[PDB]
Amino acid sequence: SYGNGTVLMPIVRRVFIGALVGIYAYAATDVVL
Amino acid sequence: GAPKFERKMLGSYPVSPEFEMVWRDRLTAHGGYIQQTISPYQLKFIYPFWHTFFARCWCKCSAYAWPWVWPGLITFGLVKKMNHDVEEDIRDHYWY
Amino acid sequence: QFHREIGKLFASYSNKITANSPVQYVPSPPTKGKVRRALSSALMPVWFKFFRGPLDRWNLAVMAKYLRDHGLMYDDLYSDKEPVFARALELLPPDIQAARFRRLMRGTYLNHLRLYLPVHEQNYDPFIPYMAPYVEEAKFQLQEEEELLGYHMWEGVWYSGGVTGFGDKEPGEHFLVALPNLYGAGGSPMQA
Amino acid sequence: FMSLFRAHLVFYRCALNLNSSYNFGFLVAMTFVLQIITGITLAFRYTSEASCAFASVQHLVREVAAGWEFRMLHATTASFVFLCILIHMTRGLYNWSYSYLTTAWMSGLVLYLLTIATAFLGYVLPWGQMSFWGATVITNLLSPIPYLVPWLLGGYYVSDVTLKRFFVLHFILPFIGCIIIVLHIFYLHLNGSSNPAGIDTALKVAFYPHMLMTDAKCLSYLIGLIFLQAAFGLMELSHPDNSIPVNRFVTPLHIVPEWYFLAYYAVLKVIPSKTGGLLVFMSSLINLGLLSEIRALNTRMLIRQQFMTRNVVSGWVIIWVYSMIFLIIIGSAIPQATYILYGRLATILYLTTGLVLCLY
Amino acid sequence: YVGKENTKGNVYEGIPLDQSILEPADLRDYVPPHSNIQYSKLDNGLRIASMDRGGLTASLGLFVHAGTRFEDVTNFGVTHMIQNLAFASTAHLSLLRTVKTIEVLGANAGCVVGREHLVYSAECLRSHMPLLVPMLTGNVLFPRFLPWELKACKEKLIMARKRLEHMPDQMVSELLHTTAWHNNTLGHKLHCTERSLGHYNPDVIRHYMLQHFSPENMVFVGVNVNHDELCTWLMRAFVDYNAIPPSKRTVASPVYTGGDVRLETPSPHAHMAIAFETPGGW
Amino acid sequence: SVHSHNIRPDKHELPASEVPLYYNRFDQADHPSLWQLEEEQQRKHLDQEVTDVSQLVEPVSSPHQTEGWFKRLRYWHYKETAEPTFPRTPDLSKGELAAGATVTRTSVWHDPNEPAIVSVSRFAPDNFRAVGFAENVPNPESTNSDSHPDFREYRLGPGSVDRRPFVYFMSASYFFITASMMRSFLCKWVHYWWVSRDMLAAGTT
Amino acid sequence: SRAVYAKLWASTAQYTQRRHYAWYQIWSRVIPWSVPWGIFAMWMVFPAMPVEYRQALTFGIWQKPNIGTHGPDP
Numbered sequence A: 001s002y003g004n005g006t007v008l009m010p011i012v013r014r015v016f017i018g019a020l021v022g023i024y025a026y027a028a029t030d031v032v033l
Numbered sequence B: 001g002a003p004k005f006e007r008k009m010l011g012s013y014p015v016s017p018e019f020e021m022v023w024r025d026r027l028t029a030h031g032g033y034i035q036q037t038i039s040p041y042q043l044k045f046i047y048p049f050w051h052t053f054f055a056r057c058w059c060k061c062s063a064y065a066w067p068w069v070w071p072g073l074i075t076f077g078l079v080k081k082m083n084h085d086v087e088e089d090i091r092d093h094y095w096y
Numbered sequence C: 001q002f003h004r005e006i007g008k009l010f011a012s013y014s015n016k017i018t019a020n021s022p023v024q025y026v027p028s029p030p031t032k033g034k035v036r037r038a039l040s041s042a043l044m045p046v047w048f049k050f051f052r053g054p055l056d057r058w059n060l061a062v063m064a065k066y067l068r069d070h071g072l073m074y075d076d077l078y079s080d081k082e083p084v085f086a087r088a089l090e091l092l093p094p095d096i097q098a099a100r101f102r103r104l105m106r107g108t109y110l111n112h113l114r115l116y117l118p119v120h121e122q123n124y125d126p127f128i129p130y131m132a133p134y135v136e137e138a139k140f141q142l143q144e145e146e147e148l149l150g151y152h153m154w155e156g157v158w159y160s161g162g163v164t165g166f167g168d169k170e171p172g173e174h175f176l177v178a179l180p181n182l183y184g185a186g187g188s189p190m191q192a
Numbered sequence D: 001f002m003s004l005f006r007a008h009l010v011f012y013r014c015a016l017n018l019n020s021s022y023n024f025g026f027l028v029a030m031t032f033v034l035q036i037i038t039g040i041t042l043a044f045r046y047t048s049e050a051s052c053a054f055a056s057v058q059h060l061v062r063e064v065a066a067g068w069e070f071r072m073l074h075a076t077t078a079s080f081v082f083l084c085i086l087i088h089m090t091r092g093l094y095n096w097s098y099s100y101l102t103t104a105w106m107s108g109l110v111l112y113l114l115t116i117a118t119a120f121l122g123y124v125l126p127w128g129q130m131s132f133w134g135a136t137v138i139t140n141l142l143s144p145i146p147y148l149v150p151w152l153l154g155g156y157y158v159s160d161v162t163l164k165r166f167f168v169l170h171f172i173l174p175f176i177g178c179i180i181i182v183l184h185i186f187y188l189h190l191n192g193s194s195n196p197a198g199i200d201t202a203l204k205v206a207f208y209p210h211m212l213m214t215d216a217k218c219l220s221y222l223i224g225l226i227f228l229q230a231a232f233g234l235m236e237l238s239h240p241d242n243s244i245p246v247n248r249f250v251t252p253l254h255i256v257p258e259w260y261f262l263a264y265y266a267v268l269k270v271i272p273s274k275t276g277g278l279l280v281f282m283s284s285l286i287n288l289g290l291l292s293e294i295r296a297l298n299t300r301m302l303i304r305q306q307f308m309t310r311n312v313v314s315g316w317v318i319i320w321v322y323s324m325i326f327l328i329i330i331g332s333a334i335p336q337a338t339y340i341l342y343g344r345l346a347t348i349l350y351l352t353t354g355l356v357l358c359l360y
Numbered sequence E: 001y002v003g004k005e006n007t008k009g010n011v012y013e014g015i016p017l018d019q020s021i022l023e024p025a026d027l028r029d030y031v032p033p034h035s036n037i038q039y040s041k042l043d044n045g046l047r048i049a050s051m052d053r054g055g056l057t058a059s060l061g062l063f064v065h066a067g068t069r070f071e072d073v074t075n076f077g078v079t080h081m082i083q084n085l086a087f088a089s090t091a092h093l094s095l096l097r098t099v100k101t102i103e104v105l106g107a108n109a110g111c112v113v114g115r116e117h118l119v120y121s122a123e124c125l126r127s128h129m130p131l132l133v134p135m136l137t138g139n140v141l142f143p144r145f146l147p148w149e150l151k152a153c154k155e156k157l158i159m160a161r162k163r164l165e166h167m168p169d170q171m172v173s174e175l176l177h178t179t180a181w182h183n184n185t186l187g188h189k190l191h192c193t194e195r196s197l198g199h200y201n202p203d204v205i206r207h208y209m210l211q212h213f214s215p216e217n218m219v220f221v222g223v224n225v226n227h228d229e230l231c232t233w234l235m236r237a238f239v240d241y242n243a244i245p246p247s248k249r250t251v252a253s254p255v256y257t258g259g260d261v262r263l264e265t266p267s268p269h270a271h272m273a274i275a276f277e278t279p280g281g282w
Numbered sequence F: 001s002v003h004s005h006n007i008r009p010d011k012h013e014l015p016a017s018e019v020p021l022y023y024n025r026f027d028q029a030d031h032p033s034l035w036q037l038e039e040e041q042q043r044k045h046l047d048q049e050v051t052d053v054s055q056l057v058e059p060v061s062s063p064h065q066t067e068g069w070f071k072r073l074r075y076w077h078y079k080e081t082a083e084p085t086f087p088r089t090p091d092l093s094k095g096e097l098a099a100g101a102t103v104t105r106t107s108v109w110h111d112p113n114e115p116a117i118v119s120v121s122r123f124a125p126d127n128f129r130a131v132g133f134a135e136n137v138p139n140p141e142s143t144n145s146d147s148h149p150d151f152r153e154y155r156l157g158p159g160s161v162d163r164r165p166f167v168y169f170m171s172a173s174y175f176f177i178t179a180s181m182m183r184s185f186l187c188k189w190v191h192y193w194w195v196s197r198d199m200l201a202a203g204t205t
Numbered sequence G: 001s002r003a004v005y006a007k008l009w010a011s012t013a014q015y016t017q018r019r020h021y022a023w024y025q026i027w028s029r030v031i032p033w034s035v036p037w038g039i040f041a042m043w044m045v046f047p048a049m050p051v052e053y054r055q056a057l058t059f060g061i062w063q064k065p066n067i068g069t070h071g072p073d074p
């Protein structure tokens, strides 16, 4: 938010989440679908 | 450290370098207080530990019972059931 | 002018939101779908009776016994490291601030000794929301500041004035601006 | 630098209700020191040449005065490094310390990976059967990544050139770790430490002498237990096959790594796919890193107190601990269909508990 | 500005200013405006007066008959406090959104305290008048007077007279008034003192406004505005909410005493002033 | 500061009140404002025109002074030797300097026909000036000599071509040369890391 | 008037959308840095690829060095 310089951790958060959604979606299509 | 509205100092003398961390965590004593402390050279310092032993032990052991012991007993049981099925499975395949 | 074309798409979606915005309070729409709100209501009499119900009741008993052992209120568990709660604490009147200070001191001492309070000192309701009026005013103040000043990613001079240049205002709080001086006796930002 | 020493180790103020759960950071640091001292001393008489490495360790024990003491202390202390770290990390998950000590948590995770890599490099140096065949296997799980293997070895197989370079890396990485410990402490003292109750409080006292004497008491226990195990051999921390010379054309009957790598080695063993097993490795680390941003994952304001006291639903960290113990048992067993079935049962708990920690 | 719909850019690129870009549809036959003052009044007693000269920048002003001559020994400094709290939080708008929205509109606004009158004013493009009216009237209709906002204004409250000391002409004038009308009416000071800080709380302020800030004691004036449009928006500002009710007050006559006062200060010149009373005033 | 002075007694370097080293002839003004008149009525050597080194003014200081074994430099002025309890009284009739300990611990300032408060007012350091002060000590008007060039000779003025394209092609060329040097050093480091020529051959059978 | 106050309140309703427009502006200024860093990456891994591939990325321009050694056997 306005007033602080914590500017990299919000980027790390969005990359980690996206990476998890892709790992567990690539495994289901191989086992289930 | 402390919030800005607590870090504000009443005095004006400069903060010395060996005390930088002390004043980064200043906190206002809202309402005030009165403190009494005795010198360690004039106290019994081992008897108080044993005087309160039973009360302290009850508090700690009671807190840990449900959360730690109950899942541990279940894990122990699963370890035995696992080892009982391994033996029976070896004889149903290799023994005549 | 490739930037002006992208700006036209943003603007079209923007005007659509505005043209469909109501001018008075309207209840929010249900989140869960009708298929999910039908299974829950059908299994409710059995799921609630034997599982969810006792889970809720055990939770409140566990919380109440821990707080009462230490003489604490539920709202004493929030930290002043949250910006919203820090602003709320600044708005308190003296009498409420003094009682919180005292309860926090007493609870740290009791947790150090690991000794329960007597039962007659535990006869109180710990779930009274004494911070609520100040929390809701704090949220209003900080939401205004963010909408009026923090709507864009602003540029700045890098590693100048004790800060990094990417948004921080208080100096020396990131490693690449650590160790401000090699000589001297230093100083406090609170004494500038 | 003496004003920094007195500001951070003498006059630093701490909450009165600290206890031994807050002493294991100091113990880990002291284990690094002991390893650096004993490691350098061993280096004066070690030979990286593959044809003579195994013999140089034995000659060191059998002929050199006090050679047995430095060899056995270095091996035992390595086990205590990982036990302390495990207790250190578990305290954080019990108290949700990463809520506001965000960069302290992330920096710690980097230190953990550095220590894992260091230990793996050191275990290959004595150049016994388990040295060779454990490196061959663990370096094949990384085969899905293209060309990440033949270069680290500098050959077509774990040859004599790999041993020379594992010695240099093993020498260097610990000192890099010492640099990152400084960052770790920077991010901690920026915010200040938490306490077991999870509350803010003004009942604090100076580090010296009250809190400094608790660290000292724990150090005594550590030194006594290390020497007890080192000089008498009560537990079996090393595998016997590493007392056998390397043979490239004879695989040992049972290949198992050190205990502190067993659990995740079991997880990767019950998953048949080789590519899917490595994705499982990344997802677990990603989950631990994401906890640094737990405040933002839900709009409800969180609290540090998790209310495990007298609670019959327990907590996710406790359930994880028992799943890890269960897998250490599976990893140490001979492959059998029944072991594989239960190993998969525990793997689900091992992974699901991590994911749900991000929910509240 | 979330994107932009127009994509034509600067259509006058490359054309120098010695050449005109207007079209015949932009030409008109001039018709002079209504430059005489027009008068109107609302039902709550507010008097309104406006005039139009055909300019594009308008001036707006709200005059209140509540100056320092109405203060007493328990109130000295209250009118100066109200001036420094102008454009603070109201029932329907916060301090930050009020001052930030005026700036973004390109307007200037302020509050000036005097011995007989208080004035709130703003200047802006004449199409923004309806937006500026509520931000002027809100100060006298429903101010909140929040504690933490009073505590943030206490600094600038003392720096006024301190800045006045190094302004000789303004200091000679103050000394002339304090000495001409000793301890009464026109002799009260304009700004606060360290003593005034003993009664700087919302209850004292709100009690002063309830005696003097009724609509009957106020006039609104605009220049370069349409009279009828100004009346409509002023009516809409007062229709849904209750204003301070009227009150009968007796105005004390000033008592002229004369006298003498000196004030030594480092300076190369000797400033001297001598005056007499004018009976009846305006 | 971290530097200490070295004021101590010395048996070989006698005190300046007894061996001054510097030329010990000074004038004395009743009030230092009078030096402004000396500066406008005395002539300066730097206002005369000379052309040869042989015509330069000769110093009044003597070259024969400091002596000793392996003493390379032979002329000095000041020293930190401690002054004794009863120093030598300066002889003002010969032009000797009176300052510091030689004012406080001697009777050099007594005048029979003046009050003491008046006499001692003339013995502050600003009251004394060495002979030759007005004729010699320079006071420059600039750092630059008119016999030397400055930017007026080298400036590119109207009608000149723009230099920006050349300045940045100079710097860019240095960088694409330095980038190539770095890329080559890294490629050589990676090769060294890879298998050697003796092991590549053993694999072929 | 209540109508005026309503329009001022709504002026900042689309905070989330405006932050997204900020994302676009900044990422458009940053993304060109991928070209310098991309050239250097290919420049580094070029010599580790087969000869046949090295001649394809350059359209037959690149060829083996001719330093006067390892010639055909009679």
Ligand SMILES: CCCCCCCCCCCCCCCCCC(=O)OC[C@H](COP(=O)([O-])OCC(O)COP(=O)([O-])OC[C@@H](COC(=O)CCCCCCCCCCCCCCCCC)OC(=O)CCCCCCCCCCCCCCCCC)OC(=O)CCCCCCCCCCCCCCCCC
Binding pocket: A005, A006, A007, A008, A009, A010, A012, A015, A016, A019, C164, C166, C174, C175, C176, C177, C178, C179, D102, D103, D106, D107, D109, D110, D113, D114, D117, D142, D179, D180, D182, D183, D285, D286, D289
């Ligand atoms: C000093 C006083 C005492 C006396 C004097 C002492 C003198 C000595 C002191 C030193 C003096 C010399 C100067 C040294 C300078 C060093 C540089 C420095 O200071 O930078 C600080 C600088 C922070 O600066 P700042 O001013 O504090 O804030 C910056 C912003 O303004 C604001 O940013 P922010 O606050 O918003 O967020 C900051 C955050 C930003 O956080 C991040 O961006 C995350 C960084 C960590 C990521 C990895 C952690 C694990 C995550 C999960 C796994 C992910 C896998 C990858 C896949 C992801 C999905 C695609 O950073 C941190 O949390 C700090 C972490 C500390 C990193 C330090 C590492 C330095 C380089 C050396 C690395 C060596 C690694 C060996 C171990 C591995 C060996 C195999 O840190 C960085 O930003 C650099 C990050 C580097 C990350 C390297 C990660 C390597 C490992 C990756 C995982 C690989 C796994 C592979 C497994 C394979 C298995 C087979």
Ligand SMILES: CCCCCCCCCCCCCCCCCC(=O)OC[C@H](COP(=O)([O-])OCC(O)COP(=O)([O-])OC[C@@H](COC(=O)CCCCCCCCCCCCCCCCC)OC(=O)CCCCCCCCCCCCCCCCC)OC(=O)CCCCCCCCCCCCCCCCC
Binding pocket: B043, B044, B045, B046, B047, B048, B050, B051
């Ligand atoms: C299993 C291993 C672990 C160790 C054994 C188990 C643990 C307990 C052992 C017994 C020690 C405590 C004895 C009672 C308390 C004494 C202090 C006191 O205040 O008492 C009077 C106090 C009432 O007196 P008062 O009139 O109110 O106040 C009088 C004082 O002025 C009050 O003044 P104050 O409060 O300020 O303090 C007075 C002060 C003054 O005390 C004195 O009287 C001064 C004594 C000077 C000597 C200090 C001891 C040094 C010994 C070192 C070893 C020998 C070195 C010599 C060479 C040996 C060569 C072979 O007291 C001390 O300094 C205590 C000294 C004794 C320390 C404990 C030593 C135990 C180990 C001994 C052998 C060494 C380890 C083995 C290694 C070597 C062999 C391989 O009563 C109590 O405190 C309540 C007593 C009930 C508590 C005892 C509960 C025992 C059962 C629980 C443990 C069961 C086993 C473990 C279960 C958990 C694991 C499964």
Ligand SMILES: CCCCCCCCCCCCCCCCCC(=O)OC[C@H](COP(=O)([O-])OCC(O)COP(=O)([O-])OC[C@@H](COC(=O)CCCCCCCCCCCCCCCCC)OC(=O)CCCCCCCCCCCCCCCCC)OC(=O)CCCCCCCCCCCCCCCCC
Binding pocket: B064, B068, B069, B072, B073, B076, D019, D020, D021, D083, D086, D087, D090, D091, D094, D196, D218, D221, D222, D225, D321, D325, D328
């Ligand atoms: C005389 C005849 C002979 C008999 C006598 C005895 C003879 C032998 C010799 C004498 C022996 C006694 C001598 C006197 C001793 C005096 C000192 C003393 O009492 O020490 C206790 C004292 C306790 O500290 P405290 O300040 O009093 O209280 C701290 C609170 O408890 C902290 O609580 P909090 O609430 O503040 O923090 C919350 C949370 C925060 O979290 C933490 O603090 C960290 C995590 C704590 C939990 C640790 C477990 C998780 C790690 C698992 C590791 C897995 C290993 C992998 C390998 C597996 C291989 C299969 O911590 C906890 O939750 C802690 C409670 C844990 C309870 C565990 C319950 C287990 C239930 C088991 C059920 C089993 C069911 C199945 C049964 C089947 C059969 C029927 O600790 C020390 O003073 C430490 C000194 C040594 C330092 C360590 C150096 C060695 C490192 C290796 C050992 C690591 C563990 C060490 C303990 C760690 C404690 C945190």
Ligand SMILES: CCCCCCCCCCCCCCCCCC(=O)OC[C@H](COP(=O)([O-])OCC(O)COP(=O)([O-])OC[C@@H](COC(=O)CCCCCCCCCCCCCCCCC)OC(=O)CCCCCCCCCCCCCCCCC)OC(=O)CCCCCCCCCCCCCCCCC
Binding pocket: F066, F067, F068, F069, F070, F071, F072
């Ligand atoms: C049976 C055989 C026995 C053989 C053993 C020897 C027997 C000798 C018996 C002689 C008896 C008759 C003569 C008695 C004289 C007594 C003088 C005396 O005590 O002083 C009285 C008296 C003391 O009164 P004072 O008040 O102390 O006055 C002192 C002055 O103020 C002083 O201060 P100042 O300010 O007046 O003077 C300026 C000062 C300051 O001047 C400077 O700083 C200027 C320097 C400019 C240098 C520029 C150089 C540039 C060119 C460089 C070329 C390239 C070189 C680098 C490349 C190298 C590549 C490898 O100049 C100096 O410091 C002069 C330096 C002289 C250095 C000569 C050292 C010779 C050593 C020979 C070896 C000894 C053994 C060594 C150890 C062997 C292993 C154990 O002194 C005078 O009046 C002045 C007299 C000075 C005489 C000096 C020369 C004496 C030579 C005697 C003969 C030696 C023969 C050796 C060979 C024999 C072969 C058979």
Ligand SMILES: CCCCCCCCCCCCCCCCCC(=O)OC[C@H](COP(=O)([O-])OCC(O)COP(=O)([O-])OC[C@@H](COC(=O)CCCCCCCCCCCCCCCCC)OC(=O)CCCCCCCCCCCCCCCCC)OC(=O)CCCCCCCCCCCCCCCCC
Binding pocket: F166, F169, F170, F173, F176, F177, F178, F180, F181, F182, F183, F184, F185, G035, G039, G042, G043, G044, G046, G047, G057, G058, G061, G062
């Ligand atoms: C006014 C002032 C004027 C002044 C005078 C004039 C000034 C200028 C004169 C200059 C004269 C020359 C001077 C000498 C320079 C060269 C010599 C030299 O330097 O050599 C290096 C020298 C020896 O060089 P070397 O290694 O023998 O050279 C071997 C060759 O590199 C052999 O390399 P290779 O065979 O391995 O690989 C070569 C290969 C390499 O190929 C590749 O890697 C890639 C090839 C495939 C590219 C595929 C591209 C696909 C896309 C195409 C797009 C087309 C678009 C078309 C559009 C059309 C529109 C109409 O290239 C080719 O095959 C040829 C390329 C043909 C294809 C055409 C395309 C080219 C790429 C174009 C990219 C795009 C450009 C435009 C971008 C912007 C617009 C988008 O090394 C040293 O001296 C080393 C000394 C030690 C250094 C120590 C450094 C420090 C150590 C300590 C470090 C630690 C401390 C840190 C210190 C840090 C300090 C900073």
Ligand code: HEM
Binding pocket: D031, D032, D035, D036, D038, D039, D040, D042, D043, D046, D057, D071, D074, D075, D078, D081, D115, D118, D119, D122, D123, D124, D125, D126, D170, D171, D174, D238
């Ligand atoms: C955290 C720090 C360290 C850890 C965890 C560690 C771990 C290990 C381990 C597990 C071994 C194999 C022991 C065996 O089974 O024989 C080993 C061996 C060795 N380490 Fe360390 N080490 C550390 C630091 C160092 C340092 C700093 C050096 C040298 C500067 C060093 C030098 C050696 C040598 C020469 C050996 C081979 C001797 C042997 O295998 O007994 N170590 N290390």
Ligand code: HEM
Binding pocket: D021, D022, D023, D024, D025, D026, D028, D029, D085, D088, D089, D092, D095, D097, D098, D101, D104, D105, D108, D109, D111, D112, D181, D184, D188, D192, D193, D194, D195
């Ligand atoms: C070489 C490895 C490490 C060293 C030397 C080290 C050192 C320390 C020390 C001395 C403390 C303060 C005292 C204490 O709380 O015990 C501390 C606190 C802390 N460490 Fe570590 N640490 C290491 C690894 C880790 C790891 C692996 C993590 C987590 C993944 C971590 C996370 C934390 C956190 C969150 C705290 C603050 C705890 C709190 O105040 O609530 N550290 N560390």
Ligand SMILES: COc1cc2[nH]c(C)c(-c3ccc(Oc4ccc(OC(F)(F)F)cc4)cc3)c(=O)c2cc1Cl
Binding pocket: D086, D089, D090, D093, D116, D138, D257, D261, D262, D263, D264, D265, D268, D281, D284, D285, D288, D316, D317, D320, D354
């Ligand atoms: C909820 O509480 C926790 C969760 C935890 N989750 C995880 C995923 C880990 C962890 C991280 C890295 C790691 O590194 C590895 C080494 C070696 C390998 O491979 C092989 F084969 F074992 F050598 C794989 C991997 C091994 C294990 C923990 O420590 C951990 C600790 C606690 Cl308390």
Ligand SMILES: [Mg+2]
Binding pocket: D294, D295, D296, D297, D298, D299, D300, D301, D302
């Ligand atoms: Mg949250």
